[PDB]
Amino acid sequence: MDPSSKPLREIPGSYGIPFFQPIKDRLEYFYGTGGRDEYFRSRMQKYQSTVFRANMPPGPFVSSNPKVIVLLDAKSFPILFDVSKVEKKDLFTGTYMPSTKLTGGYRVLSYLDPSEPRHAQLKNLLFFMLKNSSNRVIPQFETTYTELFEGLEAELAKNGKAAFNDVGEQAAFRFLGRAYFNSNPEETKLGTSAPTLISSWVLFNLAPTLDLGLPWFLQEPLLHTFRLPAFLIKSTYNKLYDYFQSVATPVMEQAEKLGVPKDEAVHNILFAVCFNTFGGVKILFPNTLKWIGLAGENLHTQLAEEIRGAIKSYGDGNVTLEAIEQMPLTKSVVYESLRIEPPVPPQYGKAKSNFTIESHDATFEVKKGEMLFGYQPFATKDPKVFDRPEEYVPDRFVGDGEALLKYVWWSNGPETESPTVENKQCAGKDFVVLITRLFVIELFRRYDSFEIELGESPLGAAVTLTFLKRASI
């Protein structure tokens, strides 16, 4: 509607009694009926607004300031991408930042504002790492995921069911080592334990804001009130560090050229691969498998046809970037997975000055220093942007629908924009889109269709294969 019809109003909501309310609120957030989605929906209903004040976890001792302004609609949300208006310093994980003792004593790239020289240096370093792996991406993905599928197939044939997540995570890390460093981590001292080592380390970092499914009387006192001692995970972290220090030589050498010490470079590479990359794929691949599986054989047949046809005609028998460009449905399927279920839901930004923001029916004033918070899942399901927003529509982005990519924000920026040293958009944006398309491609080069069953998991979606129809033999 016309902005002149959106009156300037006070931001609804209150923070309540300082120490007390944030604790009561995090209890609602983690144990209230409906979970965090209801935490946000109930407030939207209560205040009849997609913009409101609220306290956010972790609260008290871990976080010195739980107060934020929540943004749930597609009109207000984009302010979080505007680095000229919002500061993005030490807020990668929200209203608190994990101890730097968990990251070699350094404040790694993800926590740096673009105004910091190191942000440009380190992000350029990661761009180098990504470009350097370009020639290995497709071949190594094919090799790694063929191994994964052969394994799942064998498990299914012998047991009747095959859980995806675990072996899928092992495959993800195996692929990353091969693509980024031309190294199979399973041949090193890491063996097949990388996923377990990483998960433990990530837990130490994020425990304050993670719901592990434990009862409140156990989870609150031991995970949500105090930070877990960093010296306890040092041993585990060192195993990971030793791996990267030995295989990331070319990236470490480029780091020196950019003015970054080798040690700092390794800690940042470790973080980018284990935290950013692995953690994201651990969530995205199972979710994508889920949405495609729930779509039915009709979609499966169309994807198989498109994928195999493009490979034969444009790839001359092989998977090439040129071939992928000619797979419109596959591209849309991946974008729809990223829209309907953003792998990383929370984005934060702190106001650098006083300015105005607007929802679909009101105008609000934001004061310098206030923490803005956006819950992406609600914003990318805004009915004023997407028809049937709660439904997975496979071809939503095909043809004219491509214009809607301006509203796909999984990477902390419009899908149409590229990450740069000037913004805080995911450095590996194009890489994740490519590998997720490769995941779908490898799946349909081998199978005509598949069936799954879903389980109740805390960190994402638990997917189990119940049937795999082979394309040949």
For ligand HEM, the closer of residues 116 and 242 by Cβ is: 116
Q: Smallest distance, Å, CB 436 to ligand HEM?
A: 7
Indicate whether 431 belongs to the interface with ligand HEM (CB under 6 A): yes
Query: Measured between alpha carbons, how far is 272 from 248 in angstroms, rounded to an integer?
Result: 12
Strand 67-71, strand 371-375: pairing:
parallel
Q: Which residue from 26, 43, 89, 123 is in contact with ligand HEM, where contact means CB under 6 A?
A: 123
Q: Which residue from 432, 440, 441, 452 is in contact with ligand HEM, where contact means CB under 6 A?
A: 432
Q: 331: annotated binding-site residue?
A: no
Indicate whether 408 belongs to the interface with ligand HEM (CB under 6 A): no
Indicate whether 109 belongs to the interface with ligand HEM (CB under 6 A): yes
Size of site (CB under 6 A) for ligand HEM: 26
For ligand HEM, the closer of residues 90 and 147 by Cβ is: 90
Indicate whether 168 belongs to the interface with ligand HEM (CB under 6 A): no
Residue 122 near residue 260 (C-beta atoms within 8 A): yes
For ligand HEM, the closer of residues 67 and 424 by Cβ is: 424
Q: 282: annotated binding-site residue?
A: yes
Distant-in-sequence, close-in-space partners of 341: CB < 8 Å, separation ≥ 6: 287, 291, 377
Indicate whether 86 belongs to the interface with ligand HEM (CB under 6 A): no
Q: Which residue has the tokens 């041993």?
A: 235
Q: Smallest distance, Å, CB 7 to ligand HEM?
A: 31
Query: Contacts with ligand HEM in 271-310 (CB under 6 A)?
Result: 272, 276-277, 280-281, 284
Query: Contacts with ligand HEM in 433-462 (CB under 6 A)?
Result: none
Q: Is 384 exposed, middle or buried (0-12, 13-18, 19+ CB in 10 A)?
A: exposed
Q: 360: annotated binding-site residue?
A: no
Residue 451 near residue 467 (C-beta atoms within 8 A): yes
Amino acid at site 450: F
Indicate whether 202 belongs to the interface with ligand HEM (CB under 6 A): no
Q: Is 189 exposed, middle or buried (0-12, 13-18, 19+ CB in 10 A)?
A: exposed
Q: 110: annotated binding-site residue?
A: no
For ligand HEM, the closer of residues 244 and 431 by Cβ is: 431
Residue 354 near residue 368 (C-beta atoms within 8 A): yes
Indicate whether 252 belongs to the interface with ligand HEM (CB under 6 A): no
For ligand HEM, the closer of residues 223 and 334 by Cβ is: 334
Query: Which of the ranges 146-154, 358-366, 382-390, 421-429 carries the binding residues for ligand HEM, by CB under 6 A?
Result: 421-429
Q: Smallest distance, Å, CB 132 to ligand HEM?
A: 12
Q: Smallest distance, Å, CB 248 to ligand HEM?
A: 12
Indicate whether 427 belongs to the interface with ligand HEM (CB under 6 A): yes
Query: Which of the ranges 106-114, 184-192, 259-267, 325-333 carries the binding residues for ligand HEM, by CB under 6 A?
Result: 106-114
Q: Smallest distance, Å, CB 338 to ligand HEM?
A: 8
Query: Which of the ranges 119-127, 153-161, 299-307, 358-366 carries the binding residues for ligand HEM, by CB under 6 A?
Result: 119-127
Q: Smallest distance, Å, CB 423 to ligand HEM?
A: 6
Query: Measured between alpha carbons, how far is 163 from 177 in angstroms, rounded to an integer?
Result: 23
Q: 119: annotated binding-site residue?
A: yes
For ligand HEM, the closer of residues 233 and 272 by Cβ is: 272
Indicate whether 126 belongs to the interface with ligand HEM (CB under 6 A): yes
For ligand HEM, the closer of residues 333 and 468 by Cβ is: 333
For ligand HEM, the closer of residues 102 and 362 by Cβ is: 102
- What are the binding residues? 88, 119, 123, 199, 282, 424, 426
- What are the binding residues for heme b? 88, 119, 123, 424, 426
Q: Please report, as ranges, the residues that interact with ligand HEM according to CB under 6 A.
A: 88, 92, 109-110, 112, 119, 123, 126, 272, 276-277, 280-281, 284, 343-344, 347, 410-412, 424, 426-428, 431-432
